[PDB]
Structure 1
Amino acid sequence: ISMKQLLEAGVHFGHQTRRWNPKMKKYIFTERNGIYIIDLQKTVKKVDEAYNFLKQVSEDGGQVLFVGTKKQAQESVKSEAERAGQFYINQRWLGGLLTNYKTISKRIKRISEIEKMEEDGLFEVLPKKEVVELKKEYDRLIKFLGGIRDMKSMPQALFVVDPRKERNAIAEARKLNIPIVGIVDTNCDPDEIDYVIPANDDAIRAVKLLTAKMADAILEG
């Protein structure tokens, strides 16, 4: 990536001065109109480092889980994870998705069980109320766990868009020793993320650019 590309995307913006995490002082560049500006040189350096890490893990054969439940990253994370053939979470992170995998896996298998029952002709025999409630359950399961249906083990890396909102994912990943690549905005905590990426998380263009670059890294790996 290039500084001109980042500036065109809008990566430079940050949050107001009223809300801010002083642990990212090194990344803050300047102030403008009661908002902070990120250092794009350090941004590109960290983006290159994250690219290298993601490429190396992909080459080693690990799996990456994308988390973008933020409204400005749902579709971007969805599309980039689909492009890279990886997993994603863009609706809600269920408390215990990784630490309580012993039950989340059963919830995952419920999807395949419902599909098997539907394809085995149990659809019409069951009462109308039963089939409609099963449809509702299947829709909920796809909405929440749709992106990790084929995730049969713990991921080897977690790409998170906005850790401040994705507190749960950060906590579970840190507990389970899963490396994290984060789009850490100004008002976020960099110490939690293993591979920080100073960037504006409120900009659809910026988040899409960064997640696409990471997906390209994974594809190359």
Structure 2
Amino acid sequence: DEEALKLKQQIEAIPGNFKLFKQTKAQTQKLGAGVEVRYIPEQYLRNPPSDASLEDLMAAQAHMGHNTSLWNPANARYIYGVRQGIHIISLETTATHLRRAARVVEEVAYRGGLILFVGTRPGQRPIVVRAAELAKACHLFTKWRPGTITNREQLLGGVPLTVVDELDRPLSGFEDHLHDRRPLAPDLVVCLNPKENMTLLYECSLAKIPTIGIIDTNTNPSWVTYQIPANDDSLRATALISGVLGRAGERGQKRRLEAAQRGVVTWKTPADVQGYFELASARAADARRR
């Protein structure tokens, strides 16, 4: 029966072997020579770049367009040429449209806006969740429920909210307001696949919300407000684009918080909350009277 017990003392050795193995991995490793590691698959998440250069965009396959036949002729202003039977998106057009978008994400985050990073694809969940953390925004990595903006009253009815202030800390006293208030809507939607989910973008146009999308060679550029011509089918290009936009929001949220500690609010109270103010004093006016 020892043949069945010889797996236990082996399990009792895993902690010892692991500890000794990890220690051994620190001494001998890196002895031979220094490696010039200039690319890691998970580098756009651990430390995304502040800006994207022509080399970063080309290395991430951001210039690979769709087949020449499967193209929207309207979006031919960004195509550089044809090669390998596909349309090549101009690297300089992508960098310019990307920096311009990074400026929109920063300003919207600097003015206390609610951003929504949307990437709905098999492997786009870690990318979108990471960018939302940096920018302190909301993420969406699943199918967009039609009507979450135009019919928010029903869909987002029971989801809880909170009232914050200059330094983004809760304010006690708006409990009654958080039950009659209607749900929120994003102030800026950053879609990473506008071709797939057109129901979300149309609602934003109907609801007067600015949008940013990665327009591929076959996507209609008239669906978003700020286009980023690039390859959306490459999971490596999506991570770079979203990474740059994530850093933008982070840089914007910092300035907003740095300006609040000096008593300089970069935004005025929203219209809905503002209305609940004058009504609050109106109720208090009766107390002074009676």
Q: Same-fold call, TM > 0.5?
A: yes
1:104 aligns with 2:155: yes
Compare CA radii of gyration and give the structure with the larger one. Answer: 2
Q: Give the drift of 1:207.
A: 0.2
Task: Quote the residue 1:33 is aligned against.
Answer: 84
Q: Report what 1:124 is aligned to.
A: none
CA contact (8 A) 1:24 1:189 kept: yes
1:160 and 2:191 are equivalent in the alignment = yes
Percent identical among aligned pairs is: 33
Within-5 A mapping of 1:1-221 = 1-106=52-157, 108=159, 152-221=183-252
TM-score (norm 2): 0.60
Q: Which runs of 5+ in 2 are unaligned?
A: 1-51, 161-181, 253-290
Q: For CA contacts below 8 A with separation 6 or more, give which structure has more relative contact order.
A: 1
TM-score by length of structure 1 reads 0.78
Residue 94 of structure 1: how far off its partner (Å): 0.2
Sort the Cα spacing of 1:29 and 1:107 in 2 relative to 1 into closer, same or farther, 3 A: farther
1:89-139 C-alpha deviation (Å, 9 max, x unpaired): 111100101111001122535xxxxxxxxxxxxxxxxxxxxxxxxxxxxxx
Q: Is the 8 A contact 1:72 1:202 kept in 2?
A: no
Partner Cα distance (2:139, 2:248) in 1: 16
The alignment yields a C-alpha RMSD, in angstroms, of 1.5
More helix by percentage:
1
Where 2:189 maps in the other structure, the secondary structure is strand
Q: Is the 8 A contact 2:152 2:183 kept in 1?
A: no
Q: Partners in 2 of 1:166 and 1:37 — Cα distance?
A: 24
Structure 1 stretches of 4+ with a deviation exceeding 3 A read none
Tell me, in whole angstroms, the C-alpha distance in 2 between the residues paired with 1:201 and 1:152: 31
Give the Cα separation in 1 of the matches to 2:216 and 2:150. 26
Number of residues of Structure 1 aligned to a counterpart in Structure 2: 180
Change (3 A) 1:203 1:37: same
- Inter-partner Cα distance in structure 2 for 1:15 and 1:74: 23
